[PDB]
Design a protein around this ligand. Structure first.
Ligand SMILES: NC(=[NH2+])NCCC[C@H](N)C(=O)O
Lengths: 245, 675, 255, 254
């Protein structure tokens, strides 16, 4: 794996001189209940921004896999997001989409992870101009803090990813301080995690298509709302509904 | 003094005329009174060969008078008279009272509207040591301390949870020499825990559902004789194996009304010990609650949570507000069968904004921390809501609120600080709130395919086990939630599993199910809970950290069964990978994920097959590390499993419930052991 | 605006009974005022509450009393009245404002007597007959009604006899498809082609209704194939702004 | 279509001369299986009446032998269904296929309509499912058992029916009538994955009748009659039926 390579070793490049040895037959919800919710979330998100509040977002790679990418970029770009919490995959997938227009097809994916490790961090791949757009791009430009927490499933990982889960929890917690809204977009594990840490009196929006996730918004109906459509659609609507000024 | 006497009543006016239990349903006027007579006569006559039998006069218009087991409870010269829940049986009370009075018994009557239905719902230990009392469907929990005082006996309370077993004597039967005949499925986990503390395993005779719906616990025991309706051969061997002689007599016309042998009798000569006196474990506490109770269904929320948790209530007063839009106020006497249950209930009501009577307000209890990152026994588990605790008479706001934590009290220059902390952050010297005093808050695979795959995978597990191969299982907490953990621990125990790869949560919930019978506070004997609490599994996390490892938890005796138990007992290597959502974590969880990946990969070497039991995050991680030519079975209920990408040859996927799969899997591995 | 006082009994606080009653009232368009509350002495004692109900019109009052009847609410001993009866004058059609039966055991008051309804079924009417064997009340489905029969209208003189605890994909793969379908549908219309639509009531239940209307309105649809439900649900949405709540639904079919 | 063929017409046979020009947990399903089994046993002993309404998925999924065993052993007093469930069950027993898919395998690259159209045509030739059993060409299955043990069944027509069978009621006013008549005195209704028919049957049933509703799609949530008299389980219908007969067996042990 990439992180086990030692300076000095020879590594195969290009595609000459390679064959495989397979056997033979080896080889042989509701929707405008959503713009309902959206229209509300949009307005809450408005006034918190104006009032100098603090919004936190958790996000899974599914944001990138649907259209969600550039929409989250705008949000962070236009002052709506004061922190972003995720894992390895959301950062690598965003960077793959912006650096190549693809979203995992493994060559593109691994080439991204290797490049960011070559430069030594995501902020350095931005200072050096290899990253010029996207979710992670905006965070660095606009100095929005992010924490990427490791998982048992991580390729690489990126240098930025916190593979010590104890410190990862403490970094999540610290950045959650004073949060008024937590925006949770298809972030599966990270949503539950953030939930656990967050006290009442904090508005929490939860989006996923699995309406079996929104099930686990076991707080008020006045401090929790859960919708069940894809974040692409959601973040899309949320962006043009926000744009209506 | 050694002569035994029963009260019965002949079925002259017997029939099924109404429906007040599930057995009666569909059975109205389907009773054959001739067959009822000859069946009653059979019992009467077998009973007269071993005892005395007195009779009440039968009374037209009260068919269920034949079930004298519910007339009251007699101990010595005292009888507490039954008070029936349903009015269809309330007209029996005068006729029972009259018989009891005419036979010289001192008759105690319960308050009106407080139900209690007699020896049918309360059963003496046969060596007179105590009284077993049921509640849940008929008798009320708050009748129990009356029994203790009036009959002067220790009273133990058991909660019934199956509506087919609505009287204690339908699923519970103390016997001579201390043997017990019961049906575990009729009780909740706390009640079962209790039975298991009081009656030794060699003296427990837990019966099967086939025997229980023939009313095999509804048994009359004289000395070494047990009389019932129908007994399986398995049951007969069990009983006569320990010295009882079994007598079967058909009682099916009475099963149509929901009773059998023991329901048709009442033993009025019961052993009185001089050393035996009143004793109540039932506790009660009065709370006050205010808001829009009728409006937001808050009062109905709270009462539901009390019953569901195994407690009971009496609303003492309800008062509508001043004007039309005002807040309502209630005062509720809350009752529990034990302190442990009271603490679960009060935790749940604190959360809702209930508060103590001014006269009963108390300081929070404190116990010190003596180990870093370990809380003392019975620490209070915080919630997401704003919280004040009462220290030295003063209510103070808790800081850094957060849900699955403890509350630590310390002295500082500027006064007392009350702080919410997670378990691992607790430091020696700190004082932590325990108990519940002084606390308030301020607020799609077809059937055909699943069977075929179960055939294949079973055949392959058998094959690999015989060959000295290596099977690796990766499983998530849903395996335990869904109810499939005994199936998993059986696989591990019988040698089909060589390594277990998982996370923090599956280990916690499986130890939780085996220590308490709950997974995330939801009792497993029932499929349900009005809510479910975090007290049970946080206590697990804290206990294991106190010991220092799951292995130390097994060596000490506090873990006796389950998945993790079997891994330890049969030296099966397991790896627990950390995640961002982990409570605790357990001492055994690897929170360095570079090390985790390494350990996963090492235990994956030489694997011939991998079982992936509903844990997406871990199944992908494990898949990523495995080369082709390893067989992979992937089970999850969400079709997006479609990440089984390696072809028909070496990766099969099935879309169904994981416990259901595991259930059929062990079943299939059994019928391959027939020859 | 109309007011009534109802009475409710049972285990009101722990069953959620009185909570459900208040919810129905407010959600259906009325308002309530709890006048009094007698608490039972023990948990199994019965409790009673008297509640004033307001509605903005008669139509909404009877909609609300209907839902309350199911939960077992009654008129005061003093306010009991006979059910209003109106005759059937055309086979298979009920008189305006006929009461719509539910699945629960029902009694009606005729000539001061409470009478059990036979052949109880939901979404029917109740017919009253004087027979050689006395008064007969039976549920009938609308199409079984015969000219001459008397049928209960309004909501007076009706109570239920329940026991106690009786009563206690991807998305812009879509605008992908859409954009294609839209264009095909365009040129077929222009070319004088022929488009056929099948449609289930789910079109109406979501927003779909008026959108399908436009399509048919602006020449895009040359035939429509469906069932009973799509037609009744469309007509309910346009005639009342509701979409099945059974009174609205049955009133449409009867009309 | 088959019913439009007139005597005298010549019809192409064989294949010559033809070308074309182109989510309930495990714990809950078991508990409900306990309850429903106990209730079926109870009702059978009492001389009660259990009514089953079932759709073709029962047969597709592979649960028909379980259903025909229930009917054979006396737990079912009436069967209410449609054209399709009758066709596929006779198809499975005559050929081992449901919609051309071999049942010995869980799979088919495609699956053809030849097998069940041959069933529809054969039964119309005899004139009834009953005549199909008397002649020997139907020897097993759901419909077989109904005929052999004289269990009344009603088959309601629908818009999607091929054929139909001679036994299908294509006048739906009559269908509703026949459904309602066979529903009188029912103590329990089993609803085995057939939404259209389960709703129709529900609409006609008064409260106080026990209703078990089994379907794999949670929207079953149309079980509206309360915890007391309507239980719903979300799982595969054949799997349910499999555990159900298994549970009815171990209640026959003593
Ligand atoms: N001890 C008993 N099991 N008694 C059975 C009583 C049966 C009676 N019909 C009832 O519902 O109360």
């Amino acid at each position: 794996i990439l992180r086990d390579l030692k300076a000095g070793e020879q590594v195969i490049v290009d595609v000459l001189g390679i064959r495989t040895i397979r056997k033979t037959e080896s080889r042989e919800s509701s929707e405008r209940r959503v713009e309902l919710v959206v229209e509300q979330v949009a307005w809450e998100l408005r006034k918190i921004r104006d009032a100098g509040g603090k919004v936190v977002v958790t996000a899974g790679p599914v944001v990138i896999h649907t259209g969600g990418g550039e929409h989250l970029s705008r949000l962070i770009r236009e002052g709506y997001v004061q922190a972003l919490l995720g894992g390895n995959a959301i950062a690598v997938h965003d960077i793959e989409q912006n650096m190549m227009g693809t979203s995992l097809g493994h060559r593109h994916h691994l080439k991204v992870i290797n490049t960011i490790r070559r430069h030594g961090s995501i902020a350095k791949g931005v200072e050096s101009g290899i990253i010029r757009s996207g979710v992670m791009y905006e965070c660095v430009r606009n100095q929005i803090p992010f924490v990427l927490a490791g998982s048992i499933r991580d390729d690489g990982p990126l240098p930025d990813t916190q593979m010590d889960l104890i410190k990862a929890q403490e970094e999540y917690a610290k950045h959650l301080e004073g949060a008024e809204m937590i925006l949770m977009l298809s972030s599966m594990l990270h949503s539950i995690g953030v939930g656990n840490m967050t006290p009442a009196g904090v508005k929490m929006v939860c989006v996923d298509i699995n309406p079996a996730v929104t099930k686990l918004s076991d707080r008020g109906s006045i401090e929790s709302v859960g919708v069940v459509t894809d974040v692409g659609l959601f973040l899309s609507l949320l962006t043009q509904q926000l744009d209506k000024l | 003094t050694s002569r035994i006497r029963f009260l019965m009543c002949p079925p002259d006016h017997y029939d099924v005329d109404y429906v007040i239990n599930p057995w009666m349903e569909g059975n109205i006027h389907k009773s054959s009174r001739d067959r009822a007579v000859e069946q009653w006569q059979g019992l009467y006559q077998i009973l007269k060969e071993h005892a005395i039998v007195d009779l009440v006069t039968p009374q037209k218009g009260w068919p269920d008078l034949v079930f004298t087991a519910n007339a009251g409870l007699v101990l010595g010269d005292n009888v507490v008279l039954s008070r029936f829940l349903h009015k269809e049986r309330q007209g029996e009370e005068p006729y029972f009272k009259e018989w009891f009075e005419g036979n010289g018994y001192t008759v105690y009557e319960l308050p009106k509207d407080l139900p209690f239905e007699g020896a049918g719902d309360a059963l003496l230990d046969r060596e007179g040591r105590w009284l077993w009392a049921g509640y849940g469907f008929r008798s009320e929990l708050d009748s129990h301390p009356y029994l203790a005082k009036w009959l002067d006996i220790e009273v133990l309370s058991l909660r019934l949870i199956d509506e087919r077993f609505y009287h204690l004597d339908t699923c519970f039967c103390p016997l001579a020499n201390g043997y017990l005949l019961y049906y575990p499925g009729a009780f909740d986990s706390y009640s079962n825990r209790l039975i298991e503390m009081r009656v030794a395993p060699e003296k427990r005779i837990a019966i099967a559902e086939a025997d229980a719906v023939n009313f095999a616990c509804n048994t009359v025991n004289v000395e070494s004789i047990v009389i019932m309706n129908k007994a399986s051969d398995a049951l007969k061997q069990s009983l006569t194996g320990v010295g009882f002689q079994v007598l079967e007599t058909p009682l099916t016309e009475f099963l149509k009304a929901g009773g059998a042998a023991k329901a048709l009798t009442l033993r009025v000569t019961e052993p009185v010990r001089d050393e035996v006196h009143a004793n109540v474990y039932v506790e009660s506490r009065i709370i006050r609650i205010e808001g829009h109770l009728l409006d937001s269904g808050l009062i109905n929320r709270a009462l539901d949570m009390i019953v569901d948790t195994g407690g009971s209530f009496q609303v003492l007063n309800f008062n509508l507000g001043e004007q039309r839009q005002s807040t309502s106020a209630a005062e509720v006497k809350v009752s529990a069968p034990s302190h442990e249950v009271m603490e679960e209930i009060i935790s749940l009501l604190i959360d809702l904004g209930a508060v103590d009577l001014p006269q009963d307000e108390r300081d929070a209890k404190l116990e010190p921390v003596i180990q870093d990152g370990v809380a003392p026994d019975d620490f209070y588990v915080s919630t997401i809501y704003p919280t004040e605790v009462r220290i030295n008479g003063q209510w103070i706001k808790v800081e850094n609120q957060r849900m699955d934590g403890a509350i630590a009290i310390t002295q500082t220059p500027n006064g007392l600080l009350a702080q919410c902390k997670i378990l691992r952050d607790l430091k020696a010297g700190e004082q932590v709130i325990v108990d519940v005093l002084g606390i308030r808050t301020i607020r799609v695979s077809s059937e055909r395919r699943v069977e075929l795959v179960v055939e294949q995978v079973a055949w392959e597990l058998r094959k690999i086990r015989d060959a000295g191969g290596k099977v690796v299982v990766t499983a998530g907490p849903v395996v335990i939630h869904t109810g499939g953990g005994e199936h998993l621990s059986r696989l591990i125990r019988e040698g089909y599993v060589q390594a277990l790869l998982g996370g923090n949560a599956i280990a916690v919930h499986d130890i939780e199910q085996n220590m308490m019978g709950t997974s995330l506070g939801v009792d497993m004997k029932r499929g349900v809970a009005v809510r479910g609490g975090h007290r049970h599994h946080l206590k697990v996390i804290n206990t294991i950290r106190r010991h220092g490892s799951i292995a130390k938890g097994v060596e000490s005796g506090i873990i006796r069964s389950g998945v993790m138990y079997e891994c330890v007992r049969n030296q099966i290597p397991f790896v627990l990978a950390g995640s961002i959502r982990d409570d605790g974590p357990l001492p055994d969880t690897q929170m360095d994920l570079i090390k985790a990946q390494e350990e996963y990969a090492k235990h994956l070497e030489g694997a011939e097959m991998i079982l992936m039991l509903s844990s997406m995050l871990h199944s992908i991680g494990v898949g990523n590390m495995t080369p082709a030519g390893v067989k992979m079975v992937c089970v999850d209920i969400n079709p997006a499993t479609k990440l089984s990408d390696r072809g028909s040859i070496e990766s099969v996927g099935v879309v169904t419930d994981v416990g259901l799969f595991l259930s059929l899997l062990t079943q299939q591995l059994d019928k391959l052991t027939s020859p | 605006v109309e007011s009534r006082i109802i009475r409710i009994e049972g285990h009101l606080l722990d069953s959620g009974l009185i909570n459900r009653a208040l919810d129905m009232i407010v959600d259906t368009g009325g308002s309530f005022q709890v006048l009094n509350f007698n608490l039972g002495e023990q948990r199994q004692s019965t409790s009673a509450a008297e509640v004033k109900v307001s509605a903005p019109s008669h139509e909404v009052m009877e909609e609300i009393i209907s839902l309350l009847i199911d939960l077992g609410a009654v008129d005061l001993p003093q306010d009991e009245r006979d059910a209003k009866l109106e005759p059937v004058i055309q086979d298979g059609v009920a008189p305006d404002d006929f009461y719509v039966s539910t699945i629960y055991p029902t009694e009606v008051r005729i000539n001061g007597q409470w009478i059990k309804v036979e052949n109880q079924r939901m979404d029917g009417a109740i017919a009253i007959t004087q027979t050689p064997n006395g008064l007969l009340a039976q549920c009938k489905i609308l199409r079984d009604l015969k000219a001459g029969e008397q049928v209960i209208v309004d909501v007076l003189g009706i109570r239920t006899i329940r026991k106690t605890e009786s009563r206690e994909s991807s998305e812009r793969r879509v605008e992908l498809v859409v954009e294609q379908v839209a264009w095909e549908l365009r040129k077929i219309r222009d070319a004088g082609g022929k488009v056929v639509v099948t449609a289930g009531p789910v079109v109406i239940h979501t927003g779909g209704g008026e959108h399908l209307s436009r399509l048919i309105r602006e020449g895009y649809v040359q035939a429509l194939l469906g069932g009973n439900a799509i037609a009744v649900h469309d007509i309910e949405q346009n005639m009342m702004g509701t979409s099945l709540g059974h009174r609205h639904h049955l009133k449409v079919i009867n009309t």
